[PDB]
């Protein structure tokens, strides 16, 4: 919460295989990282109330055991992303802390 604080990077690969690298506050969500730093192929349309499904992720294999897998809430909006896979999850519903330093996800072809 602490403005610029405690500082975790998250890599953003979108579908063209381009990654974009930020930095994010622990405490902070997926979602906000890529809002915050305008990264392509990521939206909010209901702005992180897991009511849509346009921040829709894929965590890359190496990080899902620490991320971990969708909520039942966090399921049924994923029921409307396009191609969701195992590893897919809704960006905002990823809490960033300092053991996701360095995460990988990667962004969708579609969100909408
Ligand atoms: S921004 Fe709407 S479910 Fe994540």
Redesign the pocket.
């Known amino acids: 919460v602490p403005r610029g604080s405690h500082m975790a990077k998250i890599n953003f690969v979108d579908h063209t295989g381009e990654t974009r690298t930020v930095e994010v506050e622990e405490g902070a969500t997926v979602?906000e990282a890529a809002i915050r730093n305008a990264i392509p192929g990521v939206?909010?349309?209901?702005?992180?109330?897991?009511?849509?499904?346009?921040?829709?992720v894929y965590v890359d294999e190496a990080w899902r055991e620490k991320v971990g897998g969708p909520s039942p809430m966090?399921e049924d909006?994923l029921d409307f992303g396009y191609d969701v896979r195992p590893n897919s999850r809704?960006?905002?519903?990823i809490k960033v802390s300092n053991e996701l330093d360095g995460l990988i996800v990667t962004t969708p072809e579609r969100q909408r």
């Open positions: 979602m939206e909010a349309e209901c702005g992180g109330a897991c009511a849509c499904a346009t921040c829709h966090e909006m809704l960006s905002c519903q």
